[PDB]
């Protein structure tokens, strides 16, 4: 009952954490991403996070456990706030415009290495006023359409 786009988005999210593509999320990877998002969790908290969904008790999070974790952690915060957070993640210098270089640097930092051509294309997918950049209004439009 999920759309292939949604599944694709969750798989993409999973891969951002699973930077070594070994198939699982470790406390290390969970910590890496969170840190890349302005957070600073302790090892104890990271361990707690995994154990809360580690059904097979192997010390790591697999895809089905990841989705389990996400399903409950995004029910204690609504969309608009999350969308706003993502924008802040992309707009590094916070000048209100997501540039092509910022999009590229950000995704690389999260593990998704993209070419200048690809990133330029992504920007074009959300750009509405054709200035080659994505402002909050355009970003929100993409995330809600």
């Amino acid at each position: 009952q999920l759309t292939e786009e949604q599944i694709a988005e969750f798989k993409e999210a999973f891969s951002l954490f699973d930077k070594d593509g070994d198939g699982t999320i470790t406390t290390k990877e969970l910590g890496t991403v969170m840190r890349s998002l302005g957070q600073n969790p302790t090892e104890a908290e990271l361990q707690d996070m995994i154990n809360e969904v580690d059904a097979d008790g192997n010390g790591t999070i697999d895809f089905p456990e990841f989705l389990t974790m996400m399903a409950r952690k995004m029910k204690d915060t609504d969309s608009e706030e999350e969308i706003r957070e993502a924008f802040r993640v992309f707009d590094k210098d916070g000048n209100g415009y997501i540039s092509a270089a910022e999009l590229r640097h950000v995704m690389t930092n999260l593990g998704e290495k993209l070419t200048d051509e690809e990133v330029d294309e992504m920007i074009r997918e959300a750009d509405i006023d054709g200035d080659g950049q994505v402002n909050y209004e355009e970003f929100v439009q993409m995330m809600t359409a």
Binding site: E5, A8, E9, F10, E12, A13, S15, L16, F17, L30, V33, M34, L37, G38, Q39, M49, M70, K73, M74, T77, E82, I83, E85, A86, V89, F90, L103, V106, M107, L110, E112, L114, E118, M122, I123, E125, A126, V134, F139, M142, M143
Partner: peptide, 19 residues
């Protein structure tokens, strides 16, 4: 197959909910 901004942005939206 090839990534779109929407897909990638939502991945980040999802990932950022852990904050």
């Amino acid at each position: 197959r090839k990534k779109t901004f929407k897909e990638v942005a939502n991945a980040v939206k999802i990932s950022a909910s852990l904050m």
